[PDB]
Coordinates of C-alpha atoms and ligand atoms in Angstrom, one line a residue:
Chain A
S11 CA -53.2 -37.1 112.7
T12 CA -55.2 -35.5 109.9
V13 CA -55.5 -32.2 111.7
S14 CA -54.1 -29.4 109.5
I15 CA -54.2 -25.7 108.8
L16 CA -56.1 -25.1 105.5
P17 CA -53.5 -23.5 103.2
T18 CA -56.1 -21.5 101.2
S19 CA -57.2 -19.8 104.5
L20 CA -53.8 -18.2 104.9
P21 CA -53.9 -14.5 103.8
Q22 CA -50.9 -14.9 101.6
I23 CA -52.5 -17.7 99.6
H24 CA -55.9 -16.1 99.6
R25 CA -54.6 -12.8 98.2
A26 CA -52.5 -14.7 95.6
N27 CA -55.5 -16.7 94.4
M28 CA -57.6 -13.5 94.2
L29 CA -54.8 -11.8 92.2
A30 CA -54.6 -14.8 89.8
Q31 CA -58.4 -14.5 89.4
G32 CA -58.0 -10.9 88.2
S33 CA -60.1 -9.3 91.0
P34 CA -59.1 -5.6 91.4
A35 CA -59.4 -5.7 95.2
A36 CA -56.3 -8.0 95.4
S37 CA -54.0 -5.1 94.7
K38 CA -56.1 -2.3 96.2
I39 CA -57.3 -3.7 99.5
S40 CA -54.4 -4.0 102.1
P41 CA -54.4 -6.1 105.2
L42 CA -55.3 -4.4 108.5
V43 CA -52.2 -3.3 110.3
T44 CA -52.6 -2.7 114.1
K45 CA -49.6 -0.9 115.5
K46 CA -49.5 -2.6 119.0
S47 CA -47.2 0.0 120.5
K48 CA -45.9 -0.7 124.0
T49 CA -47.2 1.8 126.6
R50 CA -44.9 3.2 129.3
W51 CA -46.8 2.9 132.6
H52 CA -46.1 5.0 135.6
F53 CA -47.3 5.3 139.2
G54 CA -49.4 8.5 139.7
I55 CA -48.4 11.7 137.9
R56 CA -45.2 13.8 137.5
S57 CA -44.8 17.5 138.0
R58 CA -41.9 19.9 137.6
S59 CA -43.4 22.5 140.0
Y60 CA -42.2 22.6 143.6
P61 CA -43.7 20.9 146.7
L62 CA -45.9 23.8 148.1
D63 CA -47.0 24.7 144.6
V64 CA -47.9 21.1 143.7
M65 CA -49.7 20.4 147.0
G66 CA -51.6 23.7 146.7
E67 CA -52.9 22.7 143.2
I68 CA -54.0 19.3 144.4
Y69 CA -55.9 20.7 147.4
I70 CA -57.5 23.3 145.1
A71 CA -58.6 20.6 142.6
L72 CA -59.8 18.4 145.6
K73 CA -61.9 21.3 146.9
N74 CA -63.6 22.0 143.6
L75 CA -64.4 18.3 143.1
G76 CA -66.1 18.1 146.5
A77 CA -63.6 16.2 148.6
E78 CA -62.8 16.7 152.3
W79 CA -59.5 16.0 154.0
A80 CA -57.9 15.7 157.4
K81 CA -55.7 18.3 159.0
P82 CA -52.0 17.3 158.4
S83 CA -49.5 17.7 161.2
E84 CA -45.9 19.0 160.7
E85 CA -44.6 15.4 160.4
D86 CA -46.9 14.5 157.5
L87 CA -47.3 17.7 155.4
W88 CA -46.9 15.9 152.1
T89 CA -49.7 13.4 152.7
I90 CA -53.3 14.1 151.9
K91 CA -55.7 11.9 153.9
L92 CA -58.9 12.6 151.9
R93 CA -62.5 11.5 151.8
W94 CA -64.9 11.7 148.8
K95 CA -68.6 11.1 148.3
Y96 CA -69.1 9.5 144.8
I108 CA -74.0 1.0 152.5
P109 CA -70.6 2.8 152.9
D110 CA -70.7 5.9 150.7
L111 CA -67.5 7.8 151.4
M112 CA -64.4 6.7 149.5
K113 CA -61.0 7.1 151.2
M114 CA -57.8 8.0 149.4
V115 CA -54.2 8.8 150.5
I116 CA -52.3 11.1 148.2
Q117 CA -48.5 11.3 148.8
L118 CA -45.9 13.6 147.3
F119 CA -42.5 12.1 146.4
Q120 CA -39.3 13.7 145.1
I121 CA -37.8 11.8 142.1
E122 CA -35.0 14.3 141.2
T123 CA -34.1 17.9 142.1
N124 CA -36.8 19.5 140.0
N125 CA -39.0 16.4 139.5
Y126 CA -41.9 15.3 141.7
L127 CA -44.3 12.3 141.6
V128 CA -47.8 12.5 143.0
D129 CA -49.0 9.1 144.4
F130 CA -52.6 8.1 144.7
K131 CA -53.7 5.2 146.9
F132 CA -57.2 3.7 147.4
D133 CA -57.8 3.4 151.2
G134 CA -61.3 1.9 151.5
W135 CA -64.8 3.1 152.2
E136 CA -66.6 4.7 155.1
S137 CA -70.1 5.5 156.2
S154 CA -59.1 -9.7 149.0
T155 CA -62.3 -8.8 147.0
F156 CA -62.8 -5.3 145.7
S157 CA -63.2 -3.1 142.7
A158 CA -60.8 -0.3 142.1
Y159 CA -63.1 1.2 139.3
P160 CA -64.8 3.9 141.4
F161 CA -61.3 4.9 142.6
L162 CA -60.0 4.8 139.0
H163 CA -62.9 7.0 137.8
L164 CA -62.5 9.6 140.5
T165 CA -58.7 9.8 140.0
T166 CA -59.5 10.3 136.3
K167 CA -61.7 13.3 137.3
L168 CA -58.9 14.6 139.6
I169 CA -56.1 14.2 137.0
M170 CA -58.2 16.1 134.5
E171 CA -59.1 18.9 137.0
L172 CA -55.3 19.2 137.5
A173 CA -54.7 19.5 133.8
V174 CA -57.4 22.1 133.3
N175 CA -56.0 24.3 136.1
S176 CA -52.6 24.3 134.3
Chain B
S8 CA -58.7 -53.8 120.8
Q9 CA -62.0 -51.9 120.2
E10 CA -63.1 -52.7 123.8
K11 CA -59.7 -51.5 125.1
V12 CA -59.9 -48.2 123.2
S13 CA -63.5 -47.7 124.5
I14 CA -62.8 -48.3 128.2
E15 CA -59.7 -46.1 128.1
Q16 CA -61.8 -43.3 126.5
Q17 CA -64.3 -43.9 129.4
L18 CA -61.5 -43.8 132.0
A19 CA -60.1 -40.6 130.5
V20 CA -63.4 -38.8 130.4
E21 CA -64.4 -39.8 133.9
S22 CA -61.1 -38.5 135.1
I23 CA -61.6 -35.2 133.2
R24 CA -65.1 -34.9 134.7
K25 CA -63.7 -35.4 138.2
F26 CA -61.1 -32.7 137.4
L27 CA -63.8 -30.3 136.3
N28 CA -65.8 -31.1 139.4
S29 CA -62.8 -30.6 141.7
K30 CA -61.5 -27.3 140.4
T31 CA -63.2 -23.9 140.5
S32 CA -63.3 -21.0 138.0
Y33 CA -61.0 -19.2 140.4
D34 CA -58.4 -22.0 139.8
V35 CA -58.3 -21.2 136.1
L36 CA -57.2 -17.6 136.8
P37 CA -53.4 -17.0 136.3
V38 CA -51.6 -15.8 139.5
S39 CA -51.3 -12.3 138.0
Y40 CA -53.3 -11.1 135.1
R41 CA -54.8 -7.9 133.6
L42 CA -58.5 -7.0 133.2
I43 CA -59.4 -4.3 130.6
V44 CA -62.7 -2.4 131.3
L45 CA -64.2 0.3 129.2
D46 CA -66.2 3.3 130.4
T47 CA -69.7 3.2 128.7
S48 CA -69.2 6.8 127.5
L49 CA -66.2 5.8 125.3
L50 CA -66.7 5.9 121.6
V51 CA -67.3 2.6 119.8
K52 CA -64.5 3.4 117.3
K53 CA -62.1 4.0 120.1
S54 CA -63.2 0.9 122.0
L55 CA -62.6 -1.1 118.9
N56 CA -59.0 0.2 118.8
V57 CA -58.6 -0.7 122.5
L58 CA -59.6 -4.3 121.7
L59 CA -57.3 -4.6 118.7
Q60 CA -54.4 -2.8 120.4
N61 CA -54.5 -5.1 123.4
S62 CA -55.1 -8.4 121.6
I63 CA -58.6 -9.1 123.0
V64 CA -62.0 -9.8 121.5
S65 CA -64.1 -8.7 124.6
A66 CA -64.2 -6.3 127.6
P67 CA -66.6 -5.6 130.5
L68 CA -68.2 -2.2 130.4
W69 CA -68.3 0.3 133.4
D70 CA -71.1 2.8 133.9
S71 CA -69.4 5.6 136.0
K72 CA -72.7 7.4 136.5
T73 CA -74.1 4.5 138.5
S74 CA -70.9 2.7 139.6
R75 CA -72.1 -0.5 138.1
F76 CA -70.8 -2.9 135.4
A77 CA -73.0 -2.9 132.3
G78 CA -72.3 -6.2 130.5
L79 CA -69.7 -7.1 127.9
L80 CA -68.6 -5.6 124.7
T81 CA -68.2 -8.5 122.3
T82 CA -67.9 -9.1 118.5
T83 CA -71.7 -9.6 118.6
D84 CA -72.2 -5.9 119.5
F85 CA -70.2 -5.0 116.4
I86 CA -72.0 -7.5 114.2
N87 CA -75.3 -5.9 115.3
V88 CA -74.2 -2.3 114.5
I89 CA -73.0 -3.3 111.0
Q90 CA -76.5 -4.5 110.0
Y91 CA -78.0 -1.4 111.5
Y92 CA -75.6 0.9 109.6
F93 CA -76.0 -1.1 106.3
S94 CA -79.8 -0.9 106.4
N95 CA -79.6 2.8 107.3
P96 CA -76.7 4.3 105.2
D97 CA -77.8 7.8 106.1
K98 CA -76.6 7.3 109.7
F99 CA -73.0 6.7 108.7
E100 CA -71.9 10.2 109.8
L101 CA -72.9 9.1 113.3
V102 CA -70.4 6.2 113.6
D103 CA -67.8 8.8 114.7
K104 CA -70.1 10.0 117.4
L105 CA -71.6 6.6 118.7
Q106 CA -70.7 5.8 122.3
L107 CA -70.8 2.3 123.9
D108 CA -73.9 3.2 125.9
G109 CA -75.5 4.4 122.7
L110 CA -74.5 1.2 120.9
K111 CA -76.2 -0.8 123.7
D112 CA -79.3 1.4 123.2
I113 CA -79.4 0.7 119.5
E114 CA -79.2 -3.1 120.1
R115 CA -81.9 -2.9 122.8
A116 CA -84.1 -0.8 120.5
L117 CA -83.6 -3.4 117.7
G118 CA -84.4 -6.2 120.2
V119 CA -81.0 -7.7 119.5
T124 CA -76.4 -12.6 130.5
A125 CA -74.7 -15.6 132.1
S126 CA -72.3 -15.2 135.1
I127 CA -70.6 -17.3 137.7
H128 CA -68.9 -17.0 141.1
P129 CA -65.2 -18.0 141.1
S130 CA -65.8 -20.4 144.0
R131 CA -68.2 -22.6 142.1
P132 CA -67.0 -25.8 140.4
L133 CA -65.5 -25.4 136.9
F134 CA -68.0 -28.1 135.8
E135 CA -70.9 -25.7 136.6
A136 CA -69.1 -22.8 134.7
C137 CA -69.1 -25.1 131.6
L138 CA -72.8 -26.0 132.0
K139 CA -73.8 -22.4 132.2
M140 CA -71.8 -21.5 129.1
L141 CA -73.5 -24.3 127.2
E142 CA -76.9 -23.1 128.5
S143 CA -76.2 -19.5 127.5
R144 CA -74.8 -20.8 124.1
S145 CA -71.8 -18.4 124.5
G146 CA -68.1 -19.2 124.5
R147 CA -67.5 -16.9 127.4
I148 CA -68.7 -16.2 131.0
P149 CA -68.0 -13.3 133.3
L150 CA -66.6 -14.2 136.8
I151 CA -68.6 -12.2 139.3
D152 CA -68.1 -11.5 143.0
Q153 CA -69.2 -9.0 145.6
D154 CA -67.0 -6.1 146.7
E155 CA -66.4 -6.9 150.4
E156 CA -67.1 -3.3 151.5
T157 CA -69.7 -1.9 149.0
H158 CA -71.4 -5.2 148.1
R159 CA -71.5 -4.1 144.5
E160 CA -71.1 -7.0 142.1
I161 CA -67.8 -6.8 140.3
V162 CA -66.1 -8.5 137.3
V163 CA -63.1 -10.5 138.4
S164 CA -62.4 -11.9 134.9
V165 CA -64.0 -13.4 131.8
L166 CA -63.5 -17.0 131.1
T167 CA -63.8 -18.7 127.8
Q168 CA -64.5 -22.2 126.6
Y169 CA -61.0 -22.1 125.1
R170 CA -59.3 -21.2 128.4
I171 CA -61.1 -24.0 130.2
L172 CA -60.2 -26.6 127.5
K173 CA -56.6 -25.5 127.5
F174 CA -56.6 -25.6 131.4
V175 CA -57.9 -29.2 131.1
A176 CA -55.3 -30.0 128.5
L177 CA -52.4 -28.5 130.5
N178 CA -53.3 -30.4 133.7
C179 CA -54.8 -33.7 132.5
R180 CA -52.5 -36.2 130.6
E181 CA -55.6 -38.4 130.4
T182 CA -56.6 -36.5 127.3
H183 CA -54.0 -38.6 125.4
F184 CA -56.3 -41.6 126.1
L185 CA -59.2 -40.1 124.1
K186 CA -58.4 -42.4 121.1
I187 CA -61.9 -43.0 119.7
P188 CA -62.4 -41.4 116.3
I189 CA -64.7 -38.3 116.6
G190 CA -66.9 -39.7 113.8
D191 CA -67.8 -42.6 116.2
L192 CA -68.8 -40.1 118.9
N193 CA -71.8 -38.3 117.3
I194 CA -70.4 -34.9 118.3
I195 CA -69.8 -33.3 114.9
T196 CA -72.5 -31.0 113.7
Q197 CA -73.1 -32.1 110.1
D198 CA -76.7 -31.1 109.5
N199 CA -77.9 -27.8 108.1
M200 CA -74.5 -26.3 107.8
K201 CA -74.6 -22.6 107.1
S202 CA -72.1 -22.0 104.3
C203 CA -71.2 -19.5 101.5
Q204 CA -69.0 -18.9 98.4
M205 CA -66.3 -16.4 97.7
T206 CA -68.8 -14.4 95.6
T207 CA -71.4 -14.1 98.4
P208 CA -71.7 -10.5 99.5
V209 CA -70.0 -10.1 102.9
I210 CA -73.2 -8.5 104.3
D211 CA -75.1 -11.7 103.6
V212 CA -72.4 -13.7 105.4
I213 CA -72.7 -11.3 108.3
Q214 CA -76.5 -11.9 108.2
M215 CA -75.8 -15.7 108.4
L216 CA -73.8 -15.1 111.5
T217 CA -76.7 -13.4 113.3
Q218 CA -79.5 -15.6 111.7
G219 CA -77.7 -18.9 112.3
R220 CA -76.2 -17.7 115.6
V221 CA -72.8 -19.0 114.7
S222 CA -69.3 -17.6 115.2
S223 CA -68.2 -18.5 111.6
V224 CA -69.3 -19.4 108.1
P225 CA -67.3 -21.8 106.1
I226 CA -66.6 -20.8 102.5
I227 CA -66.8 -23.6 99.9
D228 CA -66.5 -23.7 96.1
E229 CA -69.1 -25.0 93.7
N230 CA -67.9 -28.6 94.3
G231 CA -68.2 -28.4 98.1
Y232 CA -64.5 -28.0 98.8
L233 CA -63.6 -26.0 101.8
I234 CA -61.5 -23.0 100.9
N235 CA -61.7 -20.6 103.8
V236 CA -64.0 -19.3 106.6
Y237 CA -65.5 -16.0 107.5
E238 CA -65.5 -15.4 111.3
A239 CA -67.4 -13.0 113.6
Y240 CA -63.9 -11.7 114.5
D241 CA -63.3 -10.6 110.9
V242 CA -66.0 -7.9 111.3
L243 CA -63.7 -6.0 113.6
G244 CA -61.1 -5.5 110.9
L245 CA -64.0 -4.6 108.5
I246 CA -65.1 -1.7 110.7
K247 CA -61.6 -0.5 111.7
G248 CA -60.9 0.8 108.2
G249 CA -63.7 2.4 106.1
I250 CA -67.2 1.0 107.0
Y251 CA -68.7 2.7 103.9
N252 CA -67.5 0.7 101.0
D253 CA -66.1 -2.4 102.7
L254 CA -69.7 -3.5 103.7
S255 CA -70.5 -3.7 100.0
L256 CA -67.7 -6.1 99.1
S257 CA -67.9 -9.8 98.4
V258 CA -66.6 -12.1 101.1
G259 CA -63.5 -12.9 99.0
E260 CA -62.6 -9.2 98.8
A261 CA -63.5 -8.4 102.4
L262 CA -61.1 -11.2 103.4
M263 CA -58.2 -9.1 101.9
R264 CA -58.6 -7.0 105.1
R265 CA -57.4 -10.0 107.2
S266 CA -54.1 -9.2 109.0
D267 CA -51.1 -11.2 107.8
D268 CA -50.8 -12.8 111.3
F269 CA -54.1 -14.6 110.9
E270 CA -53.4 -18.1 112.2
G271 CA -55.4 -20.1 109.7
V272 CA -58.4 -22.3 109.6
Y273 CA -58.1 -25.7 111.3
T274 CA -59.4 -28.8 109.7
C275 CA -59.6 -32.4 110.7
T276 CA -61.3 -35.6 109.5
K277 CA -63.7 -38.1 111.1
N278 CA -60.8 -40.4 111.8
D279 CA -59.2 -37.8 114.1
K280 CA -59.3 -38.3 117.8
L281 CA -60.0 -36.0 120.7
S282 CA -56.5 -36.6 122.0
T283 CA -55.1 -34.9 118.9
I284 CA -57.8 -32.2 119.1
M285 CA -56.8 -31.5 122.7
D286 CA -53.1 -31.4 121.8
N287 CA -53.9 -28.7 119.2
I288 CA -56.0 -26.7 121.7
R289 CA -53.1 -27.0 124.1
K290 CA -50.5 -25.7 121.7
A291 CA -52.6 -23.1 119.8
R292 CA -55.6 -20.8 120.0
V293 CA -58.0 -22.9 118.0
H294 CA -61.7 -22.3 118.3
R295 CA -63.1 -24.9 115.9
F296 CA -62.1 -27.7 113.6
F297 CA -63.8 -28.0 110.2
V298 CA -64.4 -31.6 109.4
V299 CA -63.5 -32.5 105.8
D300 CA -63.5 -35.8 103.9
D301 CA -60.6 -37.5 102.2
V302 CA -60.5 -34.9 99.4
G303 CA -61.2 -31.7 101.4
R304 CA -64.9 -31.3 101.0
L305 CA -66.8 -29.8 104.0
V306 CA -68.8 -32.4 105.9
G307 CA -69.1 -30.6 109.2
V308 CA -67.7 -28.6 112.1
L309 CA -66.5 -29.5 115.6
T310 CA -66.5 -26.4 117.9
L311 CA -65.3 -25.9 121.5
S312 CA -68.9 -26.2 122.7
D313 CA -69.3 -29.5 120.9
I314 CA -66.1 -30.8 122.6
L315 CA -67.1 -29.4 126.1
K316 CA -70.6 -30.9 125.8
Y317 CA -69.2 -34.3 125.1
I318 CA -66.8 -34.1 128.0
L319 CA -69.6 -33.0 130.4
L320 CA -72.5 -35.0 129.2
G321 CA -71.3 -37.6 126.6
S322 CA -72.8 -38.4 123.2
Chain C
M1 CA -60.1 11.9 162.4
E2 CA -61.9 15.2 161.7
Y3 CA -62.5 16.2 158.1
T4 CA -63.1 19.6 156.4
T5 CA -62.9 21.5 153.1
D6 CA -60.3 23.9 154.5
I7 CA -57.0 23.8 152.6
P8 CA -54.3 23.6 155.2
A9 CA -52.8 27.1 155.9
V10 CA -49.3 25.8 155.0
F11 CA -50.3 25.8 151.4
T12 CA -52.2 29.1 151.2
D13 CA -50.3 31.2 153.8
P14 CA -46.6 32.0 153.3
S15 CA -46.4 32.7 157.1
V16 CA -46.9 29.1 158.1
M17 CA -44.0 27.4 156.2
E18 CA -41.8 30.5 157.0
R19 CA -42.6 29.9 160.7
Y20 CA -41.4 26.3 160.3
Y21 CA -38.2 27.2 158.5
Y22 CA -37.2 29.8 161.1
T23 CA -37.9 27.7 164.2
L24 CA -35.3 25.0 163.1
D25 CA -33.1 23.2 165.7
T33 CA -35.3 18.7 158.9
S34 CA -36.7 16.1 156.5
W35 CA -40.3 17.3 157.3
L36 CA -39.9 20.4 155.1
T37 CA -39.0 18.3 152.0
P38 CA -41.2 15.5 150.6
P39 CA -39.6 12.1 150.9
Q40 CA -37.6 10.4 148.1
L41 CA -39.4 8.1 145.7
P42 CA -39.3 4.5 147.0
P43 CA -37.6 1.9 144.7
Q44 CA -40.9 0.0 144.4
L45 CA -42.6 2.9 142.6
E46 CA -40.1 3.4 139.8
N47 CA -41.4 2.9 136.3
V48 CA -38.6 0.4 135.3
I49 CA -39.9 -2.0 137.9
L50 CA -43.6 -1.4 137.0
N51 CA -43.0 -2.0 133.2
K52 CA -40.8 -5.0 133.9
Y53 CA -43.8 -6.4 135.7
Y54 CA -45.9 -5.8 132.6
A55 CA -43.3 -7.3 130.3
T56 CA -42.9 -10.5 132.3
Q57 CA -46.7 -11.1 132.0
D58 CA -46.4 -10.5 128.2
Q59 CA -43.3 -12.7 128.0
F60 CA -45.2 -15.6 129.6
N61 CA -48.5 -15.1 127.7
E62 CA -47.0 -14.5 124.2
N63 CA -43.6 -16.2 124.3
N64 CA -43.8 -19.0 127.0
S65 CA -40.7 -17.6 128.7
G66 CA -40.3 -17.4 132.5
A67 CA -43.3 -17.4 134.9
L68 CA -46.1 -14.9 135.7
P69 CA -44.7 -12.3 138.1
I70 CA -46.0 -11.5 141.7
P71 CA -46.2 -7.8 142.3
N72 CA -44.7 -6.1 145.3
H73 CA -47.3 -5.8 148.0
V74 CA -46.4 -2.1 148.6
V75 CA -47.7 -1.0 145.2
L76 CA -51.1 -2.6 145.7
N77 CA -54.1 -0.1 145.4
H78 CA -51.8 2.6 143.9
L79 CA -52.8 4.5 140.8
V80 CA -51.1 3.5 137.6
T81 CA -51.3 5.9 134.6
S82 CA -50.2 6.5 131.0
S83 CA -50.0 9.4 128.5
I84 CA -53.4 10.6 127.2
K85 CA -53.9 9.1 123.8
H86 CA -56.7 10.1 121.4
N87 CA -58.5 12.1 124.2
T88 CA -58.6 8.9 126.3
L89 CA -57.1 8.4 129.7
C90 CA -56.0 4.9 130.6
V91 CA -55.6 4.3 134.4
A92 CA -55.0 1.1 136.4
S93 CA -54.4 -0.4 139.8
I94 CA -52.8 -3.7 140.7
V95 CA -55.2 -5.2 143.2
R96 CA -55.5 -8.4 145.2
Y97 CA -58.2 -11.0 144.4
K98 CA -58.0 -13.7 147.1
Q99 CA -54.4 -15.0 146.4
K100 CA -54.2 -13.8 142.8
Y101 CA -53.4 -10.3 141.4
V102 CA -55.6 -8.4 139.0
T103 CA -54.4 -5.3 137.2
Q104 CA -57.7 -3.5 136.9
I105 CA -57.6 -1.3 133.9
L106 CA -60.1 1.5 132.9
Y107 CA -60.4 3.4 129.7
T108 CA -62.3 6.7 130.1
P109 CA -62.9 9.5 127.6
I110 CA -61.6 12.9 128.6
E111 CA -61.5 16.3 126.8
Ligands
ADP401 N1 -71.4 -22.6 110.0 C1 -72.1 -23.4 110.8 N2 -73.2 -24.0 110.3 C2 -73.9 -24.9 111.1 N3 -73.6 -25.1 112.4 C3 -72.5 -24.5 113.0 C4 -71.7 -23.6 112.2 N4 -70.7 -23.1 113.0 C5 -70.9 -23.7 114.2 N5 -72.0 -24.5 114.2 C6 -72.5 -25.3 115.3 O1 -73.4 -24.5 116.1 C7 -73.0 -24.6 117.5 C8 -72.4 -23.3 118.1 O2 -71.5 -22.8 117.1 P1 -70.4 -21.7 117.4 O3 -71.0 -20.5 118.1 O4 -69.6 -21.5 116.2 O5 -69.5 -22.5 118.5 P2 -69.2 -22.1 120.0 O6 -70.5 -22.0 120.6 O7 -68.3 -23.2 120.5 O8 -68.4 -20.8 119.8 C9 -72.1 -25.8 117.6 O9 -72.8 -27.0 117.8 C10 -71.4 -25.9 116.2 O10 -71.1 -27.2 115.8

């Protein structure tokens, strides 16, 4: 095999050769450093407010954004079964409230299809972005 | 001996072609993987950070206003905006304000795209990439409820060649020297020297429509290469003065984790080439002579074309 | 199901929940505990296993729990940009569809 890595193409050797030449840029121009920081991902969003308070804020935000929702019974109060406009045109979502700890709650958002194996979550991702922002503005 | 090497090369290629004809683009997809998409209203500068932060050179764009995908952000988009900004230095204060949809407008105004269904044969995906003269192709399907076309993934020539290499031991029987195959591009090489202004090298990329420009010295010895990808690090810092540097100086911006330029000779074999593609992200092999003078380049498209269509 | 833009009285009227709490004879009145499948340790392990395979050739690409499919994944706002995702099924494979959108 005569397949190799060209030594002069490595940044260390290229910089060193430029330095030896006398070029000012060799000392002054630094390599690009990209801080690839590891993101902590979560499902949905967290709130320290209590259930009725949190649910109220979501419904408020939902109303201002133009969503409609089903009437919840006593057995599913912490579940929002909503529909949103954005050919099936109405997007369905299920929002669910969970308790993490005593004072800590997690809001769960779930894409639930469209109304009149292979699908794009992007319309859902965009609308949830709108919703999350509306929730931030109101706080 | 010669006849043996030849028929074995022929058996290996026919086997690789059958493989490509028998697999689909869907098959190349990992069982679980991530797809990064950018909203068209995102700033170009931020989008560049997203690429560099996530170790990718490309991303599909999403127009939220119309619920439609809007093509791909690639290094070419950044190449085109550099030339625009250089020829119009007054606009530099607008870099900070330029959004991806704006960037696409600028390119359209300056007068400066292939897709495939996952179910189609991998062979056909390769043909379409050769026809479009690009190293990547979006995988497109229809949303089963909305019937909006959606991007499932983006496949590259690299990923396909690596897929072939990982699954086909037959590559080891590709023992004919590449110089005997007439697959090296040797004629009308676009090249430069370390003292060439980087803007001129960037022009060569667009004018020649190549991904890289080999840097030689006065005697024709290969020293380094400037790649389309290098333009991303050039923008990240300070567009203003970096565009005025020589290629030698602009290269100082290369990250220390740059993997290096790969070279080979005419006596090298596709078996070796495929082993290298298998073990590392290599996008081209510069062909040098016995003393390290540039004689040509062998790119992923050159290798794929040979596998699909022969010499 | 019927749909309307009327926020359920239980969230606007203190009389409704009060009514429920006084007519006791239990878990309905408190939202359910977070399922183990939605904890961030499991979600980020899933992300790390993909990274360990693609960058370090260790282990094998992870299959996500089917219960977390089509659920919103989020991260802290950075540089006025919100990054959201959802792990979704494509035929028999799993795509984490990721969107970067500018906010304000
Ligand atoms: N600097 C160059 N000068 C002349 N031809 C080149 C150069 N770089 C690549 N080529 C040739 O042009 C074609 C496409 O080049 P390139 O875009 O770099 O490869 P790919 O299409 O595989 O990414 C190939 O046939 C390749 O051999």
